């Protein structure tokens, strides 16, 4: 019998029974319909095949199950999407991202300095959540003492994307957007008159095919970047480190061999899959991997399910930092492949290498059976992760 599940319900993704439900879907109905008839691609093959057919599986209806499209690149199809992405790509060239290494490392060291003397911290609150916020906030010109405000707006907006909000939460969402809009339009006006090397400056000057980003587009695209920056990577940092601590042979391998870190980051991404789904709207009736789909309905791409697909990943419930190949779909695939992937990987690398070296005897206070995941239908990971370690003095 099929699992009785609602794939638009955030409680499904907070359940540690989700992977059992995905396993059934992959073995019995790869393009699954949930208890409300919502279609979802559960196998790696079905996700890739949909990703590769953007004219049939469109982003232009919006990437959430019951919300309309917003005027931003992730809700656009080519050719318009390609121009928008090329414009925003000025902020994400390989050289610009790699050049952030020293500054990101400094933030990692400041955050570890704040807890290293204590011998205990909440890995989520004190390391995983603040590092990506500080990096993206610095790119956007946010004063350090205002990071919490931007993180609050980001939580409001990602909660809106992660659920079907009440009217009161709709109002909060609109208020947060209005505050972000006000701040960002001030930055745009200032950078136009006195350009710097910050993200808004680089985006203002970007030109492709004789076109530039409008103020409207700058607000929307930088907001997409803010929330990608501050709502996703945190969950790979916490949940990926959790797996290193649960399987101490994996922690020990990384401690003794820094050259294993790139493969470890990939396995942390495969395992944690912070983005649980993105939607595609059907542009025509189609028979897709055994399931009839109707023009105008949305189908979810279940990235965590694909990342645990035994047809692609041998023994997928084994966390193995050495896994090769590791062609996971945490960042998706195709036209919309995460623009921030290099930045996210760099943050994960720099914080993890410092955690391994500076907190070398790190351990979990209590095991996973009592560590909850955030209820959310879109992006999710650990709420809290208390950890202990031998104290050390700060680097300063
Ligand atoms: C581990 C962290 C992250 C994960 C798992 C992640 C995941 C994703 C996924 C699944 C998509 C859609 C791909 C698809 O549907 O095939 C996406 C798109 C995108 N992401 Fe991320 N993301 C992360 C971090 C970031 C960061 C840090 C940024 C920016 C600084 C960012 C910016 C974007 C943008 C702009 C898009 C839209 C690309 C397009 O539509 O062409 N993401 N991301
Ligand atoms: C109601 O007005 C608005 C306006 C803007 C937004 C924010 N749009 C948005 C933000 C974040 C993501 C998640 C994500 C980003 C990058 N990589 C991976 C995941 C998707 C869409 C919401 C509501
Ligand atoms: Br299949
Ligand atoms: Br479009
Ligand atoms: Br920048
Ligand atoms: K505020
Ligand atoms: K397994």
- The atom number, within ligand 2, closest to the CA of 157 reads 22
Closest by alpha carbon to 276, among 371, 342, 373, 352? Answer: 373
Phi-psi region of 141 (alpha: psi -120 to 50; beta: other; left: phi over 0): left
Ligand 3 mean position, distance from CA 45 (Å)? 5
Ligand 5 mean position, distance from CA 91 (Å)? 6
Q: Is 101 helix (H, G, I), strand (E, B) or coil?
A: helix
The residue ranges of every structural domain in the chain are 1-396
Which two structure tokens, joined as six digits, stand for 304?
Answer: 């965590």
For tokens 């993704």, the residue is 13
What are the φ/ψ torsions at residue 205 (nearest 5 degrees)?
-80, -10
Ligand 5 mean position, distance from CA 288 (Å)? 41
- The atom number, within ligand 1, closest to the CA of 84 reads 41
Cα–Cα dist 200/224, whole Å: 13
CB 153 within 8 A of CB 183: no
> Which residue among 52, 237, 340, 382 has the greatest number of ligand 1 atoms within 8 angstroms of its CB, and so is best to mutate?
340
Cα–Cα dist 257/35, whole Å: 47
The helix (run of H) or strand (run of E) holding residue 20 is helix 18-28
The beta-strand segments (E) located in the chain are 31-33, 39-41, 57-58, 120-122, 277-282, 286-288, 291-293, 298-302, 363-364, 386-388
Q: Give the resolution to one decimal, in Å.
A: 1.3
Between strands 31-33 and 57-58, the pairing is unpaired
Distant-in-sequence, close-in-space partners of 331: CB < 8 Å, separation ≥ 6: 269, 337, 338, 341, 344
Cα–Cα dist 382/168, whole Å: 26
CB 170 within 8 A of CB 160: yes
Cα–Cα dist 288/281, whole Å: 13
Beta bridge partners of 388: 120, 363
- Tally of residues, the chain: 396
Phi-psi region of 119 (alpha: psi -120 to 50; beta: other; left: phi over 0): left
Phi-psi region of 297 (alpha: psi -120 to 50; beta: other; left: phi over 0): beta
160 lines ligand 2 (CB under 6 A): yes
Cα–Cα dist 31/42, whole Å: 6
> Which residue among 73, 331, 351 has the greatest number of ligand 1 atoms within 8 angstroms of its CB, and so is best to mutate?
331
Give the ligand at the shortest distance from the Cα of 278. Answer: 1
Between strands 31-33 and 291-293, the pairing is unpaired
- The annotation status of 338 as a binding-site residue, yes or no, is yes
176 lines ligand 2 (CB under 6 A): no
- With vertex at residue 302, the alpha carbon angle to CA 297 and CA 304, rounded to the nearest 5 degrees, is 170
CB 361 within 8 A of CB 251: no
- With vertex at residue 222, the alpha carbon angle to CA 218 and CA 224, rounded to the nearest 5 degrees, is 125
Cα–Cα dist 357/374, whole Å: 29
C-alpha count within 13 angstroms, C-beta hemisphere, residue 313: 25
Distant-in-sequence, close-in-space partners of 186: CB < 8 Å, separation ≥ 6: none
Cα–Cα dist 101/103, whole Å: 6
161 lines ligand 2 (CB under 6 A): yes
The b/e string for 123-154 (b: 16+ C-beta within 10 A; e otherwise) is: bbbbbbbbbbbbbbbbbbbbeeeebebbbebb
The closest residue, in CA terms, to atom 21 on ligand 2 is 224
Q: How was this structure determined?
A: X-ray
């Amino acid at each position: 019998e099929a699992p009785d599940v609602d794939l638009a319900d955030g409680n499904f993704y907070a359940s540690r029974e989700a992977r059992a439900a995905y396993r059934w879907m992959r073995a019995n109905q790869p393009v699954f319909r949930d208890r409300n008839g919502l279609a979802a691609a559960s196998t790696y093959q079905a996700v890739i095949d949909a990703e590769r057919q953007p004219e049939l599986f469109s982003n232009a209806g919006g990437i959430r199950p019951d919300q309309p499209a917003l005027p931003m690149m992730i809700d656009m199809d080519d050719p318009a999407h390609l121009l928008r992405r090329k414009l925003v790509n000025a902020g994400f060239t390989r050289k610009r991202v790699k050049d952030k290494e020293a500054s990101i490392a400094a933030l990692c060291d400041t955050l570890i300095d704040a807890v290293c003397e204590r011998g205990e911290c909440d890995f989520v609150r004190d390391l995983a959540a603040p590092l990506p916020m500080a990096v993206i906030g610095d790119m956007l010109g946010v004063r350090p003492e205002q990071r919490d405000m931007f993180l609050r707006w980001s939580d409001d907006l990602v909660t809106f994307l992660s659920s079907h909000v009440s009217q009161e939460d709709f109002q909060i969402t609109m208020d947060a957007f209005a505050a972000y809009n006000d701040f960002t339009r001030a930055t745009i006006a200032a950078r136009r008159a006195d350009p710097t090397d910050d993200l808004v400056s680089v985006l203002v000057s970007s030109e492709v095919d004789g076109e530039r980003l409008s103020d409207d587009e700058l607000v929307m695209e930088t907001l997409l970047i803010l929330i990608g920056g501050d709502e996703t990577t945190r969950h790979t940092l916490s949940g990926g480190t959790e797996q290193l601590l649960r399987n101490r042979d994996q922690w020990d391998l990384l401690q003794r061999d820094p050259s294993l870190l790139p493969g470890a980051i990939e396995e942390m991404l495969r395992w944690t899959a912070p983005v649980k789904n993105m939607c595609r709207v059907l542009t025509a009736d189609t028979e897709f991997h055994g399931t009839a789909l109707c023009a105008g309905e949305k189908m979810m791409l279940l990235f965590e399910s694909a990342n645990f697909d035994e047809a692609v990943f041998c023994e997928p419930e084994k966390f193995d930092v050495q896994r090769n190949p590791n062609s996971h779909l945490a960042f998706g695939f195709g036209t919309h492949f995460c623009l921030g992937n290099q930045l996210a990987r760099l943050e994960l690398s720099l914080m993890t290498e410092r955690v391994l070296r500076r907190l070398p005897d790190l351990r979990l206070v209590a095991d996973d059976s009592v560590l909850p995941l955030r209820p959310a239908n879109f992006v999710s990971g650990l709420e809290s992760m208390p950890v202990v370690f031998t104290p050390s003095p700060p680097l300063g």
